[PDB]
């Protein structure tokens, strides 16, 4: 239908309490991916991507009863963050990673640290010095790419930081850890493991390049978590000096990544027709009318909106298949 016909449904969805978004995330179990895509396009269109992401992130933080597991599970929140970073952080990812990865793709020099995988005669020591050289150059490129990360994403990171400080006030470690979990575990380290998904690379890595990518991503992830490899990871121990000496640089990077206090937001005016995505979301409400009606029967602050939602869903279904 014409975009205007969805304007009632849309003002419900964009409300600050996000009760419709919460109900939708509930009824959509597996198909988080689809819901995330539609919601992000809608909220992006309206310049309300921060309202969506910041609110969902704070909700996850509030529900977490163990700070060590924060954001580890696959949620709508984490899925939205991944899609959002994918859409906006490409220049950061290229600035951070492209040159290092293209060198690795072209390199004939092994970083193999497992002696048993040496098979036909090379030297782990030589392989370690090389890996440590790769790591130094890379980590410098990542840290100095800080300013390239878009302001809005940095603002969203700053909001994560204020949120975990409030939740765990005597834990002085969370404000860097919560940022690491997005920019490394869910952005940089996946990109090193599969450089194709940010189109850094076009062809599958050679075996030596493939191994180096794995060992580089492993090393970076441990530095990102500010932890040395232990005795259960015996061959990775040679990277421990690198991690130890670089832990403070990692902390400085993660801390300052969120140092955008105010919402930037400026993009002027993006109003292409949105009714296509509004129709997609309406289909979801219709597909789950049964569930949402069950959720609407619960008293509480969400109840007003949800009864309103089912109403709107039925009316748009009237206007749809009406005789004309």
Q: Both 221 and 107 in a single domain?
A: yes
Q: How far apart are alpha carbons 307 and 133 in whole angstroms? A: 61
Q: 1: closest CA among 271, 318, 307?
A: 318
Q: Both 84 and 153 in a single domain?
A: no
Question: How many angstroms separate the Cα of 162 from the Cα of each of 3, 156, 209, 255, 277?
Answer: 37, 10, 40, 11, 32
Burial class of 212 by CB neighbour count within 10 A (0 to 12, 13 to 18, 19+)? buried
Question: How many angstroms separate the Cα of 125 from the Cα of each of 112, 137, 246, 251, 284?
Answer: 10, 19, 21, 29, 57
Q: Are 98 and 137 in contact (CB under 8 A)?
A: no
Q: How far apart are alpha carbons 49 and 167 in whole angstroms? A: 23
Tokens representing 301 are 């602050």
Last residue of a domain, one of 236, 264, 292: 264
Tokens representing 317 are 């279904």
Q: Both 308 and 257 in a single domain?
A: no
- 54 CB-near residues (< 8 Å, 6+ apart): 156, 159
Cα Rg, the chain, nearest whole Å: 23
- 128 CB-near residues (< 8 Å, 6+ apart): 111, 113, 238, 239
Q: How far apart are alpha carbons 209 and 227 in whole angstroms? A: 25
Residue carrying the six token digits 């809005």: 152
Q: Are 179 and 254 in contact (CB under 8 A)?
A: yes
Resolution in A: 1.6
DSSP letter at 69 equals G
Q: Both 157 and 290 in a single domain?
A: no
Q: Both 77 and 98 in a single domain?
A: no
Q: Both 29 and 94 in a single domain?
A: no
Q: How far apart are alpha carbons 302 and 310 in whole angstroms? A: 13
Domain range spanning residue 270? 1-88+265-324
Q: Both 321 and 311 in a single domain?
A: yes
| Helices 207-224, 90-106: crossing angle, 10 deg rounding | 140
Q: How far apart are alpha carbons 213 and 236 in whole angstroms? A: 14
Last residue of a domain, one of 233, 249, 264: 264
Q: Both 186 and 169 in a single domain?
A: yes
Q: Both 178 and 70 in a single domain?
A: no
Q: Both 249 and 321 in a single domain?
A: no
Sign of the four-CA dihedral 41, 42, 48, 49: negative
Q: Both 29 and 177 in a single domain?
A: no
Q: How many domains does the chain have?
A: 2
Helices within 29-123 (DSSP H only)? 32-45, 49-63, 76-88, 90-106
Q: How far apart are alpha carbons 290 and 294 in whole angstroms? A: 7
Residue carrying the six token digits 């850094």: 200
Q: How far apart are alpha carbons 223 and 226 in whole angstroms? A: 5
Question: How many angstroms separate the Cα of 286 from the Cα of each of 36, 255, 314, 317?
Answer: 17, 44, 8, 8
| 3-class state of residue 63 by DSSP | helix
Tell me phi and psi for residue 188, to 5 degrees: -65, -45
The domain that holds 76 is classified in CATH as: 1.10.506.10
**DSSP states along 266-286:** ---------HHHHHHHHHHHH
Last residue of a domain, one of 219, 249, 264: 264
Q: How far apart are alpha carbons 276 and 33 in whole angstroms? A: 17
Residue carrying the six token digits 């449904």: 9
Q: Both 227 and 103 in a single domain?
A: yes
């Amino acid at each position: 239908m014409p975009e205007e016909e969805y304007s009632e449904f849309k003002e419900l969805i964009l409300q600050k309490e996000l009760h419709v978004v919460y109900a939708l995330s509930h009824v959509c179990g597996q198909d988080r991916t689809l819901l995330a895509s539609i919601l992000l396009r809608i909220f992006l269109h309206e310049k309300l991507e921060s309202l969506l992401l910041c609110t969902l992130n704070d909700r996850e933080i509030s529900m977490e009863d163990e700070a060590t597991t924060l954001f580890r599970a696959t949620t709508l929140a984490s899925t939205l963050m991944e899609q959002y970073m994918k859409a906006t952080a490409t220049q950061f990812v290229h600035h951070a990673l492209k040159d290092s990865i293209l060198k690795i793709m072209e390199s004939k020099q092994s970083c193999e640290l497992s002696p048993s995988k040496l098979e036909k005669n090379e030297d782990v020591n030589t392989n370690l010095t090389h890996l440590l050289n790769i790591l130094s150059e890379l980590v410098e490129k990542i840290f100095m790419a800080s300013e390239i990360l878009p302001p809005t994403l940095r603002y969203i990171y700053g909001c994560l930081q204020k949120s975990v400080q409030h939740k765990w006030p005597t834990n002085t470690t969370m404000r860097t850890r919560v940022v690491s979990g997005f920019v490394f575990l869910r952005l940089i380290c996946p990109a090193i493991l599969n450089p194709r998904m940010f189109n850094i690379i076009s062809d599958s890595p050679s075996p030596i390049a493939a191994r180096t990518l794995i060992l580089v991503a492993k090393s970076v992830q441990n530095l990102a978590n500010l932890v040395e490899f232990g005795a259960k990871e015996p061959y990775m121990e040679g990277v421990n000096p690198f991690i130890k000496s670089n832990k403070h640089r990692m902390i400085m990077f993660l801390d300052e990544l969120g140092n955008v206090p105010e919402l930037p937001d400026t993009t002027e005016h993006s109003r292409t027709d949105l009714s296509r995505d509004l129709a997609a979301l309406h289909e979801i409400c219709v597909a789950h009318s049964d569930e949402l009606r069950t959720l609407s029967n619960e008293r509480g602050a969400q109840q007003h909106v949800l009864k309103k939602l089912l109403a709107i869903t039925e009316l748009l279904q009237q206007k749809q298949n009406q005789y004309t």
